[PDB]
């Protein structure tokens, strides 16, 4: 069934709990949120785990296999392909390094339930939240994302919205200036893209370890370039998905996690 997996890549945790730990019991808060197991690298685990294995009367069944090579020593796209053949059990869920939230994944695995659209991966994301102001930092490093934003107002078709391609600043907007293949436009041709869409790295997954074996998706680094090719005829192949929401959650990507915990994440 559902399986967890955590990636990794100042380091001192500010909000009175370890940075690495914030996805351990948070993804398994109640019954429901129970995956099969979670996996992690070493990351000097003795400080982390000895406090993480405290207060035990709760059947904390924690197996955790350790590697070292997909830990910024190798690209986590191609290196993960060999790291799944003993790891496969059923459906997959990956986790980013230091994710935080407010609304629990109990309603996010509810989004994984009613997925009879023979999907392979849905991606629950969110944009930027309400920031401070016109900041005293550098310019807006905007990840220009290439996707379909709002829900489909059409029955039976892309009933959750679709991520189509994936790019950012400095790759296309500074070389080819936002060019899109009109061929990949032809499937669901009424798209909407945004700029503040924070790649939440959550990435509900499925049995494409049985079906990644054809050539073309095997050269994928960064774990998103599978619908970045249209993968069709010059019919269409399998489909991705994407989901987001309105308010009342968190995450962190940048060095602003020092100030995310200051005024936004206060706990009482």
């Amino acid at each position: 069934s559902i399986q967890a997996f955590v990636f990794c890549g100042a380091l001192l945790p500010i909000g009175n709990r370890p940075m690495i730990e914030y996805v351990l019991d948070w993804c398994d808060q109640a019954d429901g949120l129970t995956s099969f197991l979670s996996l992690r690298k070493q990351q000097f685990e003795l400080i982390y785990k000895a406090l993480s294995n405290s207060n035990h009367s709760h059947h904390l069944q924690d197996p955790k296999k350790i590697n070292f090579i997909p830990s910024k020593a190798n690209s986590t796209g191609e290196s993960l392909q060999k790291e799944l053949l003993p790891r496969i059990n059923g459906d997959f869920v990956i986790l980013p390094c230091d994710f935080v939230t407010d609304i629990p994944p109990q309603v996010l695995v509810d989004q994984f339930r009613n997925r009879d659209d023979n999907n392979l991966a849905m991606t629950i994301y969110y944009k930027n939240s309400l920031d401070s102001s016109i900041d005293k930092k550098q310019q807006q490093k905007q990840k220009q994302q290439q996707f379909f934003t709002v829900y489909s107002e059409n029955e039976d078709s892309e009933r959750q919205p679709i991520l189509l391609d994936v790019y950012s600043q400095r790759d296309v907007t500074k070389t080819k200036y936002l060019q899109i293949r009109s061929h990949l436009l032809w499937n669901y041709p009424n798209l909407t893209v945004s700029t503040k869409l924070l790649n939440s790295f959550i990435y509900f997954c499925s049995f494409e370890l049985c079906q990644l074996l054809k050539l073309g998706p095997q050269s994928m680094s960064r774990q998103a370039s599978f619908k970045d090719p249209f993968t069709g005829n010059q019919g269409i192949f399998i489909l991705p998905n994407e989901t987001l929401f309105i308010r009342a959650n968190n995450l962190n990507a940048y060095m602003d996690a020092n100030r995310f915990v200051l005024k936004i994440k206060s706990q009482t």
Binding site: S1, D31, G32, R113, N114, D116
Partner: protein
Amino acid sequence: LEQSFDNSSLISSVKELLLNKDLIHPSILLLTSHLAHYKIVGSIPRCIAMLEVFQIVIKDYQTPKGTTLSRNLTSYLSHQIDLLKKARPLSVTMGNAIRWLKQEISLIDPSTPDKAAKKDLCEKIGQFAKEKIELADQLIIDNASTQIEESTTIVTYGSSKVLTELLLHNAISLKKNIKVIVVDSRPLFEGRKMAETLRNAGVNVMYALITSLDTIFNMDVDYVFLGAHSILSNGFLYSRAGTAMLAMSAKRRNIPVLVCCESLKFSQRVQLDSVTFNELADPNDLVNKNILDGWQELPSLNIVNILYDLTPPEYIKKVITEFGALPPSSVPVILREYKGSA
């Protein structure tokens, strides 16, 4: 309050369970998730889909130590049925399969090493729907086709369950001329699934709504065929809501009405009133800022949504099953001769 059918307690709106004594199959929650949030079934689609998850859930046996496989699965599978009862109460297409399945739980002995437990159950419960459904529907095909001439019309109601395959056979597999009249109703627009399919099949389809029903009958029209949900022991057709209004009118307008059905869709129970034994389904659905909101909290307002309703058997002219055709008063004689006997 004078009829007090709002206080007819055939269903509630209870949800939000958390119990984990049983090992609940995750995929059978998906079946209940696929029903109650937005209904995607007829009755024999359920009888397929209820069987679709049953072959999977028996494959994960998980038989405990001091318990025979005859002793646990009569509790294990039946505890998962109550998950469906929270979503939607059963049909006879539900009901006749599961009591037949509980026979098969009981007729096994403590001899199976659980490797043999697949194929004595798997093909057997596969040969159930192979015989009781699939080639049962094959005998529907030849029987209805000889009762239909070319260049005529068919009036259906809602999403059909078996006569979709009948209309495919006469339009494509026999190529005789035919015009199709599909009518469905607010809120469940399940007849549009047929309206997509038969014009994807390339045949003359005239979609309709039940409020405009007279002007269909004011044209060249005959051969009203119907889907079904169960047949009463009298001859009443317990079926989808709004079936009887065309069934009274077409019988009033002296053109015959048939009900495509099967012996699996018979029943031992009997009644003769529409609002006695039924199911309500989430009164928020008949709304779509909207026009009104607040059937709750406002004085003197309620939304009903009838799912099932009876039709008098005098409206039905001929009842066709896989064994053949029969007049509607002669329904319960198969209950002593084939159902549990054949």
